[PDB]
């Protein structure tokens, strides 16, 4: 335990957080570069944090090229270290750094393709990510993108209940959640991915809500207010209000202008209101949009 920690040379702090601090580090004996997530167990004296319990147990079951890899876990007396592979950048900083030129379409296609592969692996292994946002997606110089931050992930061999405090940030939150659904489903991760796909394409967040109600209205305004025909049961949901404005669905070619027929088709299926009808990651991978996918390398300004 203490010996393993000695084999690591801290390079520099690369991130903060509730769980603790993350450092870029190097294995002194092997030269392997890694990311060390540090967790102080004396900040709450409540044992190992639930969040860590789940991230560790679920992550060590998810070995896939498009899912951040957990290399080790060092549990000292007063500290817990999670050792991960290291990646140079996250999608949020990349989008920001690509504002002027815009991420090229082939690269956007590649990233979406890879994200769907990692997400499919999660889902077919009964794991819901539940916090898919640009910032939690890691990218390297070779052109790979991987899912990261499983701090809110949950196994769903048994139904996962909705909880007000543990939810993805507003902008990527699925409509069912906003309308108060009782249980989570794989569909919430596809929705998030859809919002990310659109953001990469247009260079602007698709539904940038200021609050829960504003988030719903922005979604309604673009996709049309859903009715019983579009989403059976929607008017019966806990937070649905008969007083909701009735907006018509905007033309998709005006929402994501640079996209072709295939792109628009894929995105609309990822943004289907009815979670039971929203395309699965598995099926999304078979969509013709990915007909000619390649693996371009990003321009990482570092």
């Amino acid at each position: 335990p203490l010996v393993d920690m000695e084999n690591f040379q801290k390079v520099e702090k690369i991130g903060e957080g509730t769980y603790g601090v993350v450092y870029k580090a190097r294995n002194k004996l092997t030269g392997e570069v890694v990311a060390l997530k540090k967790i102080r167990l004396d900040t709450e004296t409540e044992g190992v944090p639930s969040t860590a319990i789940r991230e560790i147990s679920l992550l060590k079951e998810l070995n896939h090229p498009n899912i951040v890899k957990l290399l080790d876990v060092i549990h000292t007396e007063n500290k817990l270290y999670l050792v991960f592979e290291f990646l140079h950048q996250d999608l949020k900083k990349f989008m920001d750094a690509s504002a002027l030129t815009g991420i090229p379409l082939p690269l956007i296609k590649s990233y979406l393709f890879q994200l769907l592969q990692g997400l499919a692996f999660c889902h077919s292994h009964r794991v819901l990510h539940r916090d898919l946002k640009p910032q939690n997606l890691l990218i390297n110089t070779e052109g790979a993108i991987k899912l990261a931050d499983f701090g809110l992930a949950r196994a769903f061999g048994v139904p996962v209940r909705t909880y007000t405090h543990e939810v993805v940030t507003l902008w990527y939150r699925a409509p069912e959640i906003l309308l108060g659904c009782k249980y989570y489903s794989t569909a919430v991760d596809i929705w998030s991915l859809g919002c990310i796909f659109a953001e990469m394409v247009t260079r602007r967040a698709l539904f940038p809500g200021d609050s829960e109600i504003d988030q719903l209205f922005r979604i309604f305004r673009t996709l049309g207010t859903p009715d019983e025909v579009v989403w059976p049961g929607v008017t019966s949901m806990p937070d649905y209000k008969p007083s909701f404005p009735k907006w018509a669905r905007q033309d998709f070619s005006k929402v994501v202008p640079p996209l072709d027929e295939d792109g628009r088709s894929l995105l609309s299926q990822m943004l289907h209101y009815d979670p039971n009808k929203r395309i699965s990651a598995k099926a999304a991978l078979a969509h013709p949009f990915f007909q000619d996918v390649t693996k371009p390398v990003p321009h990482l300004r570092l």
Binding site: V48, I53, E61, H125, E166
Partner: protein
């Protein structure tokens, strides 16, 4: 029917074979017995009722305890500490908002300190190598329930009841996979409540025939019949509640005509 339903099933069937404890670990324990274990689980059932915890939590904690005892010799006086730590870990993994440690120290009647509970949590995590996402009877029943065209809440409750009873007796349930105990509990409950039998769709899904479930089914039936006379009663009491349609009060058929 979900899109990853089959994949998840195939996968849970794979994991249950790995998170399987050693069937005969109790004889190799020098100080604890099946009886002491039964008293432990029964207690955990009450704790689960006291803090309104999910049934999955109870199941996860039991899986942890059997895996832990499969490799660690434990004395009478520490068996409850392990169980407490197990329940705490299970709550942290499954519950939306787990109870605070003080509560787990409370429910032991100050037998153990907060310090001892946290150290045991650490030891249990080490011994289990942080592999806490284990498959349960609960999970498999959930998977099976979606093949019930005539969605029946009574059947489910009874199935859950039969599955929970199997947790109490290491003998003979430790020798059965969670997916098999679930298959037996499903058929028995379906049969008792509707007179129907293990459905063709589930035979195709699990590969289990009614003939394959027989050995476990026979034991589960006997456990059902004897349920009222069992030294441990927490599960029966719990299932008297209208929340479960009082299925613990339902009378088991005399025979199964298998």
């Amino acid at each position: 029917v979900p899109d990853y339903h089959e994949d998840i099933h195939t996968y849970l069937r794979e994991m249950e074979v790995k998170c399987k404890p050693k069937v005969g670990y109790m004889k190799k324990q020098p100080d604890i017995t099946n009886s002491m274990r039964a008293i432990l689980v029964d207690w955990l059932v009450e704790v689960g009722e006291e803090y309104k915890l999910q049934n999955e939590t109870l199941h996860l904690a039991v899986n942890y305890i059997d895996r832990f005892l499969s490799s660690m010799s434990v004395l009478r006086g520490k068996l409850q500490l392990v169980g407490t730590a197990a329940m705490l870990l299970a709550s942290k993994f499954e519950e939306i908002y787990p109870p605070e440690v003080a509560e787990f120290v409370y429910i032991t009647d100050d037998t153990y300190t907060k310090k001892q509970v946290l150290r045991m949590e650490h030891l249990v995590l080490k011994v289990l190598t942080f592999d806490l996402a284990a498959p349960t009877v609960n999970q498999f029943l959930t998977q099976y329930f979606l093949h019930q065209q005539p969605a029946n809440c009574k059947v489910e409750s009874l199935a859950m009841f039969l599955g929970e009873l199997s947790l109490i007796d290491a003998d003979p349930y430790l020798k059965y996979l969670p997916s098999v105990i679930a298959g037996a509990a499903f058929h028995l409950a379906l049969y008792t409540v509707t007179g129907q039998s293990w459905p063709e769709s589930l035979i195709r899904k699990t590969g289990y025939t009614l003939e394959s479930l027989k050995p476990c089914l026979m034991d589960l039936h006997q456990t059902y019949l004897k349920a009222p006379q069992h030294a441990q009663q927490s599960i029966r009491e719990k299932y008297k509640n209208s929340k479960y349609h009082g299925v613990s009060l339902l009378n088991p058929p005399e025979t199964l005509n298998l």
